[PDB]
Design a protein around this ligand. Structure first.
Ligand SMILES: Cc1nc(C)n2nc(CCc3nc(N4CCCC4)nn3C)nc2c1Cl
Ligand SMILES: [Mg+2]
Ligand SMILES: [Zn+2]
Length: 313
């Protein structure tokens, strides 16, 4: 009850910044997450014994893939933490509770393969879930872990509060399907510009939380250049493995996933920052001004990929 988590001074200061890197010591990531929940939500949001048991069951259900692993989960939750802390007053007690859990859980039991490869392989998950295949699986795994004995971190919530939080988590996780991001951001663009955007309209909040989820999920592009550069290697290691598997089924993979097109990575990153990342952090900064550092950091890394193309590294 009187048991604060405290981090070493450098982490205690740096964890408050958008560009924080959680570092290579796996054994500190649970503590970092609890620290974030305590400061973001209160020390009485979850029973500590239940939270720790939940964190360790979630960790166990992430797999040893190059990118979509336990480190990604805690990284996406840290970015959500920075957004919530820099926008104190705009979020309900239930949203604060739900969204950090959503981020930790948003890629549960990921195998390193796109929804596309599941559908072309004809994986059972593609028959159970026609769209946002992995994302419906991720939510389904979250509910499973929540239903293990000793794991209901929401046990103190009322019946209707519980249903509200599981519904926040469900939409949050569905929204991490990047196929859905384009239309979601387009609608938010128009709603902001025509002045119709209304944070009391629950369907408008949903969209805004959806954009935050995309922003947190892509936050590797908002880190210090050496972090961004080295994460890109993990991202392509999965993509190229998938491309290999596409070829195994007798299919030319998209260039993104073809390891023969290694040499064109810098140009593919350009496309990605221009088509996806910059639009994402732009629209988020307009709706939530204190998230500007994510846009600024994104632009800095775009400029670093331009330098790679021009032979300056
Ligand atoms: C955080 C993050 N999240 C995602 C989902 N992605 N996807 C990419 C691939 C970008 C891309 N590469 C290519 N290739 C063309 C030939 C060589 C490369 N095309 N495209 C579009 N990068 C990222 C990042 Cl950084
Ligand atoms: Mg995902
Ligand atoms: Zn993710």
């Amino acid at each position: 009850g009187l048991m604060q988590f405290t981090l070493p001074v450098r982490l205690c200061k740096e964890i408050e910044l958008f560009h924080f890197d959680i570092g290579p010591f796996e054994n500190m990531w649970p503590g970092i997450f609890v620290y974030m929940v305590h400061r973001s939500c209160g020390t009485s949001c979850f029973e500590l014994e239940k939270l720790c048991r939940f964190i360790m069951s979630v960790k166990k259900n992430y797999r040893r893939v190059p990118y979509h692993n336990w480190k990604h989960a805690v990284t996406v939750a840290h970015c959500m933490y920075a957004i919530l802390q820099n926008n104190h007053t705009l979020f309900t007690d239930l949203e604060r509770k739900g969204l950090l859990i959503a981020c930790l859980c948003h890629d549960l039991d990921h195998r390193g393969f796109s929804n596309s490869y599941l559908q072309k392989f004809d994986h059972p998950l593609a028959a159970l879930y026609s769209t946002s295949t992995m994302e419906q699986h991720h939510f389904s795994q979250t509910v499973s872990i929540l239903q293990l004995e000793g794991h209901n971190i929401f046990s103190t919530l009322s019946s209707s509060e519980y249903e509200q939080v599981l519904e926040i988590i469900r939409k949050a996780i569905i929204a991490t399907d990047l196929a859905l991001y384009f239309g979601n951001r387009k609608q938010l663009e128009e709603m902001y510009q025509t002045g119709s955007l209304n944070l009391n309209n629950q369907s408008h909040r949903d969209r805004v939380i959806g954009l935050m989820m995309t922003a947190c999920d892509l936050c590797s592009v908002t880190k210090l250049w050496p972090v961004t550069k080295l994460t890109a290697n993990d991202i392509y290691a999965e993509f190229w493995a998938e491309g290999d598997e596409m070829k195994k089924l007798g299919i030319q993979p998209i260039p993104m996933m073809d390891r023969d097109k290694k040499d064109e990575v810098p140009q593919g990153q350009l496309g990605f920052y221009n088509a996806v990342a910059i639009p994402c952090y732009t629209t988020l900064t307009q709706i939530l001004p204190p998230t500007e550092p994510l846009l600024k950091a994104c632009r800095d890394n775009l400029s670093q990929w331009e330098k790679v193309i021009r032979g300056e590294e």
